[PDB]
mmCIF file of C-alpha atoms in Angstrom:
data_model
loop_
_atom_site.group_PDB
_atom_site.id
_atom_site.type_symbol
_atom_site.label_atom_id
_atom_site.label_comp_id
_atom_site.label_asym_id
_atom_site.label_seq_id
_atom_site.Cartn_x
_atom_site.Cartn_y
_atom_site.Cartn_z
ATOM 1 C CA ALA A 23 -4.840 -38.708 6.394
ATOM 2 C CA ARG A 24 -1.432 -38.545 7.810
ATOM 3 C CA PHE A 25 2.343 -38.650 5.807
ATOM 4 C CA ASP A 26 5.691 -39.635 7.655
ATOM 5 C CA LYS A 27 8.623 -37.789 6.799
ATOM 6 C CA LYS A 28 9.513 -39.568 3.516
ATOM 7 C CA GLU A 29 6.304 -38.678 1.399
ATOM 8 C CA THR A 30 6.473 -35.011 2.632
ATOM 9 C CA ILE A 31 9.955 -34.594 1.864
ATOM 10 C CA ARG A 32 9.329 -36.538 -1.512
ATOM 11 C CA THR A 33 5.898 -34.393 -2.284
ATOM 12 C CA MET A 34 7.761 -31.239 -1.672
ATOM 13 C CA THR A 35 10.477 -32.168 -3.835
ATOM 14 C CA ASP A 36 8.314 -33.488 -6.648
ATOM 15 C CA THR A 37 5.710 -30.731 -6.971
ATOM 16 C CA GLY A 38 8.126 -27.971 -5.914
ATOM 17 C CA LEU A 39 5.374 -25.679 -4.844
ATOM 18 C CA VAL A 40 4.424 -24.846 -1.432
ATOM 19 C CA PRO A 41 1.081 -22.799 -0.943
ATOM 20 C CA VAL A 42 0.872 -20.596 2.262
ATOM 21 C CA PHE A 43 -1.885 -19.375 3.611
ATOM 22 C CA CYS A 44 -3.877 -17.853 6.548
ATOM 23 C CA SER A 45 -5.357 -19.928 9.483
ATOM 24 C CA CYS A 46 -8.378 -16.830 8.923
ATOM 25 C CA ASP A 47 -11.563 -18.834 8.480
ATOM 26 C CA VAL A 48 -12.020 -22.714 8.079
ATOM 27 C CA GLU A 49 -14.850 -22.334 5.138
ATOM 28 C CA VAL A 50 -12.358 -19.878 2.990
ATOM 29 C CA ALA A 51 -9.250 -21.376 3.914
ATOM 30 C CA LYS A 52 -11.632 -24.672 2.621
ATOM 31 C CA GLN A 53 -12.110 -23.241 -0.835
ATOM 32 C CA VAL A 54 -8.162 -22.311 -0.993
ATOM 33 C CA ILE A 55 -6.789 -25.045 -0.355
ATOM 34 C CA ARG A 56 -9.914 -27.052 -2.575
ATOM 35 C CA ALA A 57 -8.962 -24.934 -5.339
ATOM 36 C CA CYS A 58 -5.451 -25.216 -4.764
ATOM 37 C CA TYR A 59 -5.203 -29.143 -4.954
ATOM 38 C CA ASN A 60 -7.706 -28.989 -8.719
ATOM 39 C CA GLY A 61 -4.872 -27.356 -9.479
ATOM 40 C CA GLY A 62 -2.397 -30.221 -8.286
ATOM 41 C CA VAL A 63 -0.662 -28.706 -5.272
ATOM 42 C CA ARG A 64 -0.285 -31.725 -2.578
ATOM 43 C CA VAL A 65 1.576 -29.692 0.317
ATOM 44 C CA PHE A 66 -0.073 -27.162 1.567
ATOM 45 C CA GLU A 67 1.411 -24.683 4.668
ATOM 46 C CA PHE A 68 -1.179 -23.005 7.451
ATOM 47 C CA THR A 69 0.421 -20.334 8.973
ATOM 48 C CA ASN A 70 -0.117 -19.232 12.963
ATOM 49 C CA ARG A 71 -0.122 -15.887 12.500
ATOM 50 C CA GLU A 72 -4.389 -15.057 13.538
ATOM 51 C CA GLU A 73 -5.701 -15.353 17.229
ATOM 52 C CA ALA A 74 -6.809 -19.494 17.787
ATOM 53 C CA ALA A 75 -4.851 -20.150 14.675
ATOM 54 C CA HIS A 76 -4.259 -24.128 15.619
ATOM 55 C CA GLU A 77 -8.366 -24.192 16.306
ATOM 56 C CA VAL A 78 -8.460 -22.724 12.305
ATOM 57 C CA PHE A 79 -5.958 -25.734 11.360
ATOM 58 C CA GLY A 80 -7.695 -28.534 13.385
ATOM 59 C CA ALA A 81 -11.046 -28.122 12.006
ATOM 60 C CA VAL A 82 -9.330 -28.171 8.402
ATOM 61 C CA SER A 83 -7.347 -31.180 9.412
ATOM 62 C CA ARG A 84 -9.535 -32.923 10.604
ATOM 63 C CA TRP A 85 -12.278 -32.003 6.983
ATOM 64 C CA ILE A 86 -8.897 -32.061 4.279
ATOM 65 C CA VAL A 87 -8.932 -36.155 4.803
ATOM 66 C CA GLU A 88 -11.892 -36.838 2.947
ATOM 67 C CA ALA A 89 -12.023 -34.063 1.030
ATOM 68 C CA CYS A 90 -8.408 -33.539 -0.412
ATOM 69 C CA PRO A 91 -7.160 -36.894 0.343
ATOM 70 C CA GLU A 92 -3.841 -36.842 -0.675
ATOM 71 C CA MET A 93 -2.467 -33.089 0.502
ATOM 72 C CA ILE A 94 -0.198 -33.040 2.877
ATOM 73 C CA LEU A 95 -0.413 -30.214 5.856
ATOM 74 C CA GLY A 96 1.656 -28.539 7.838
ATOM 75 C CA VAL A 97 2.058 -25.116 9.727
ATOM 76 C CA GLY A 98 4.394 -22.557 9.276
ATOM 77 C CA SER A 99 5.715 -19.121 11.228
ATOM 78 C CA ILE A 100 6.476 -20.751 14.185
ATOM 79 C CA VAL A 101 9.502 -19.733 16.898
ATOM 80 C CA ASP A 102 8.949 -21.723 20.124
ATOM 81 C CA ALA A 103 8.506 -25.719 20.558
ATOM 82 C CA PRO A 104 5.672 -25.785 22.432
ATOM 83 C CA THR A 105 3.538 -24.781 19.472
ATOM 84 C CA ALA A 106 5.342 -26.962 17.316
ATOM 85 C CA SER A 107 4.044 -29.417 19.383
ATOM 86 C CA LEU A 108 0.425 -28.168 19.626
ATOM 87 C CA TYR A 109 0.333 -28.464 15.841
ATOM 88 C CA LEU A 110 2.154 -31.997 15.699
ATOM 89 C CA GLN A 111 -1.127 -33.058 18.011
ATOM 90 C CA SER A 112 -3.123 -31.051 15.558
ATOM 91 C CA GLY A 113 -1.734 -33.621 12.688
ATOM 92 C CA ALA A 114 0.268 -31.143 11.407
ATOM 93 C CA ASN A 115 2.738 -32.772 8.879
ATOM 94 C CA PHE A 116 5.762 -30.356 8.999
ATOM 95 C CA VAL A 117 6.362 -27.531 10.533
ATOM 96 C CA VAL A 118 8.301 -24.769 9.245
ATOM 97 C CA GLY A 119 9.153 -21.591 10.386
ATOM 98 C CA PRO A 120 10.954 -17.240 9.383
ATOM 99 C CA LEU A 121 13.666 -18.439 11.532
ATOM 100 C CA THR A 122 15.946 -21.528 13.249
ATOM 101 C CA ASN A 123 14.849 -22.295 16.674
ATOM 102 C CA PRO A 124 16.814 -25.384 17.857
ATOM 103 C CA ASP A 125 14.120 -26.592 20.289
ATOM 104 C CA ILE A 126 11.755 -26.807 17.487
ATOM 105 C CA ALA A 127 13.798 -28.835 15.611
ATOM 106 C CA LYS A 128 13.934 -31.413 18.958
ATOM 107 C CA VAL A 129 10.479 -31.321 18.880
ATOM 108 C CA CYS A 130 9.721 -32.280 15.466
ATOM 109 C CA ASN A 131 12.987 -35.020 15.419
ATOM 110 C CA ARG A 132 11.223 -36.938 18.100
ATOM 111 C CA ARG A 133 8.280 -37.862 15.794
ATOM 112 C CA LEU A 134 10.177 -37.493 12.245
ATOM 113 C CA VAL A 135 8.277 -34.746 11.714
ATOM 114 C CA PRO A 136 10.399 -32.000 8.893
ATOM 115 C CA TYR A 137 11.088 -29.309 10.106
ATOM 116 C CA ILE A 138 11.953 -26.323 7.961
ATOM 117 C CA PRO A 139 13.402 -23.201 9.632
ATOM 118 C CA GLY A 140 14.564 -20.337 8.417
ATOM 119 C CA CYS A 141 18.003 -19.102 6.960
ATOM 120 C CA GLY A 142 18.973 -16.425 6.198
ATOM 121 C CA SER A 143 22.703 -17.216 5.720
ATOM 122 C CA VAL A 144 25.213 -20.057 4.753
ATOM 123 C CA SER A 145 26.173 -21.108 8.552
ATOM 124 C CA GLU A 146 22.434 -20.860 9.407
ATOM 125 C CA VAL A 147 22.001 -23.353 6.545
ATOM 126 C CA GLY A 148 24.533 -25.818 7.730
ATOM 127 C CA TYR A 149 23.449 -25.334 11.357
ATOM 128 C CA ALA A 150 19.891 -26.601 10.114
ATOM 129 C CA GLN A 151 21.512 -29.618 8.826
ATOM 130 C CA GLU A 152 23.351 -30.851 12.270
ATOM 131 C CA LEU A 153 20.002 -30.696 13.598
ATOM 132 C CA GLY A 154 18.463 -32.698 10.900
ATOM 133 C CA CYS A 155 16.989 -30.449 9.282
ATOM 134 C CA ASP A 156 16.446 -32.080 5.340
ATOM 135 C CA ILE A 157 15.247 -29.236 4.231
ATOM 136 C CA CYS A 158 16.098 -25.891 5.155
ATOM 137 C CA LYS A 159 14.096 -22.170 4.554
ATOM 138 C CA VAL A 160 16.206 -19.795 2.462
ATOM 139 C CA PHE A 161 14.222 -16.566 4.185
ATOM 140 C CA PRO A 162 13.432 -14.023 2.784
ATOM 141 C CA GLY A 163 14.553 -14.932 -0.694
ATOM 142 C CA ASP A 164 13.986 -12.189 -2.622
ATOM 143 C CA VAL A 165 16.398 -10.062 -0.243
ATOM 144 C CA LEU A 166 18.968 -13.234 -0.715
ATOM 145 C CA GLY A 167 18.513 -13.760 -4.207
ATOM 146 C CA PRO A 168 19.101 -16.814 -6.565
ATOM 147 C CA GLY A 169 22.511 -16.517 -6.148
ATOM 148 C CA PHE A 170 22.677 -16.841 -3.100
ATOM 149 C CA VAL A 171 21.201 -20.644 -3.188
ATOM 150 C CA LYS A 172 23.569 -21.306 -6.304
ATOM 151 C CA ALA A 173 26.520 -19.840 -4.227
ATOM 152 C CA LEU A 174 25.657 -22.693 -1.831
ATOM 153 C CA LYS A 175 24.764 -25.447 -3.497
ATOM 154 C CA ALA A 176 28.334 -25.794 -5.154
ATOM 155 C CA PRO A 177 30.345 -26.269 -1.695
ATOM 156 C CA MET A 178 27.175 -27.931 -0.119
ATOM 157 C CA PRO A 179 25.392 -30.036 -2.888
ATOM 158 C CA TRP A 180 23.485 -32.075 -0.702
ATOM 159 C CA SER A 181 21.329 -28.926 0.536
ATOM 160 C CA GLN A 182 17.711 -28.776 -0.218
ATOM 161 C CA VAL A 183 16.093 -25.453 0.516
ATOM 162 C CA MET A 184 12.949 -23.988 0.587
ATOM 163 C CA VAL A 185 12.685 -20.557 -1.074
ATOM 164 C CA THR A 186 10.545 -18.196 0.774
ATOM 165 C CA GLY A 187 9.394 -14.333 -0.568
ATOM 166 C CA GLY A 188 10.104 -12.517 -3.991
ATOM 167 C CA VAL A 189 8.898 -15.902 -5.650
ATOM 168 C CA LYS A 190 6.906 -15.454 -8.052
ATOM 169 C CA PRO A 191 4.104 -17.999 -10.105
ATOM 170 C CA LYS A 192 6.017 -16.166 -13.490
ATOM 171 C CA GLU A 193 8.510 -18.255 -15.397
ATOM 172 C CA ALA A 194 11.276 -16.302 -15.677
ATOM 173 C CA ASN A 195 11.399 -15.876 -11.716
ATOM 174 C CA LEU A 196 10.335 -20.213 -11.398
ATOM 175 C CA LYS A 197 13.377 -20.509 -13.550
ATOM 176 C CA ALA A 198 15.747 -18.193 -11.679
ATOM 177 C CA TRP A 199 15.105 -19.538 -8.269
ATOM 178 C CA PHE A 200 15.205 -23.742 -10.068
ATOM 179 C CA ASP A 201 17.744 -23.130 -11.919
ATOM 180 C CA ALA A 202 19.615 -22.115 -9.197
ATOM 181 C CA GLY A 203 19.661 -25.356 -6.920
ATOM 182 C CA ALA A 204 16.472 -24.428 -5.309
ATOM 183 C CA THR A 205 14.087 -27.403 -4.460
ATOM 184 C CA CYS A 206 11.162 -26.172 -3.899
ATOM 185 C CA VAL A 207 9.244 -22.551 -3.756
ATOM 186 C CA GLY A 208 6.735 -21.145 -1.233
ATOM 187 C CA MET A 209 4.403 -18.284 -2.112
ATOM 188 C CA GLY A 210 1.464 -16.558 -0.596
ATOM 189 C CA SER A 211 0.126 -13.296 -1.501
ATOM 190 C CA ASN A 212 0.954 -14.481 -5.496
ATOM 191 C CA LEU A 213 -0.486 -17.543 -5.962
ATOM 192 C CA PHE A 214 -3.780 -15.922 -3.955
ATOM 193 C CA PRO A 215 -4.522 -12.822 -4.913
ATOM 194 C CA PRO A 216 -6.374 -11.003 -2.523
ATOM 195 C CA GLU A 217 -9.643 -10.088 -5.588
ATOM 196 C CA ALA A 218 -9.891 -13.746 -6.430
ATOM 197 C CA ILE A 219 -10.446 -14.654 -2.571
ATOM 198 C CA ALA A 220 -12.702 -11.893 -2.568
ATOM 199 C CA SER A 221 -15.395 -12.709 -5.520
ATOM 200 C CA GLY A 222 -14.195 -16.549 -5.145
ATOM 201 C CA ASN A 223 -12.830 -16.421 -8.273
ATOM 202 C CA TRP A 224 -11.489 -20.037 -6.987
ATOM 203 C CA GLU A 225 -10.730 -20.926 -10.859
ATOM 204 C CA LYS A 226 -7.756 -18.326 -10.918
ATOM 205 C CA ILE A 227 -6.213 -20.185 -8.083
ATOM 206 C CA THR A 228 -6.420 -23.088 -9.709
ATOM 207 C CA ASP A 229 -5.163 -21.742 -12.188
ATOM 208 C CA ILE A 230 -2.414 -20.054 -10.974
ATOM 209 C CA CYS A 231 -1.660 -22.599 -9.159
ATOM 210 C CA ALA A 232 -1.647 -25.259 -11.963
ATOM 211 C CA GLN A 233 0.762 -23.270 -14.261
ATOM 212 C CA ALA A 234 3.343 -22.506 -11.682
ATOM 213 C CA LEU A 235 3.073 -26.519 -11.596
ATOM 214 C CA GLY A 236 3.153 -26.613 -14.438
ATOM 215 C CA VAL A 237 6.597 -24.385 -15.405
ATOM 216 C CA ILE A 238 8.551 -26.060 -12.256
ATOM 217 C CA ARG A 239 7.749 -29.124 -13.676
ATOM 218 C CA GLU A 240 9.611 -28.436 -17.000
ATOM 219 C CA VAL A 241 12.377 -26.749 -15.470
ATOM 220 C CA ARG A 242 13.249 -30.316 -13.977
#
């Protein structure tokens, strides 16, 4: 359907896992979303990386209302404000990017749509917060590491961080990030082995998602 900022933040916080998938093929995207939904995933991020990716997103967005009615769909890899506006027109419930662009914050704030900008320093986290961003994306996480989140959260306990990059659906990796204070994690390649997609092994996608979500749940 369409979910307001309150539900999106809460659902992201509670599940703690945001799959990150390409906008390649509409039919492949539907299957990945179906497999993730069955695994318990309720927030899903499409990336704006292929040509006319917003057209794939629009098709999936209209289909997902009946197919996976509790899935909250959002867009990632956004670096400019007009493209963020375009996906808001297409039904995006949250906007994520690898960097921070204040113009995007302005356009997202105008519709109370959560903007999750990429941050790579404690100052960048703070400026994003000043812009009204409730969740900041620590990116790339493998570069900054769990210690970055732990160090930031001590003087800035209000901070809520999504970690993306270098997160794995393994218990030792997930424990490290959530013990450090992460609110949710984003994952792409590690949630969908390219082998499993190519052969249509969707139950494998469901299982990895379920297992990762289960580890997050007992960590919390």
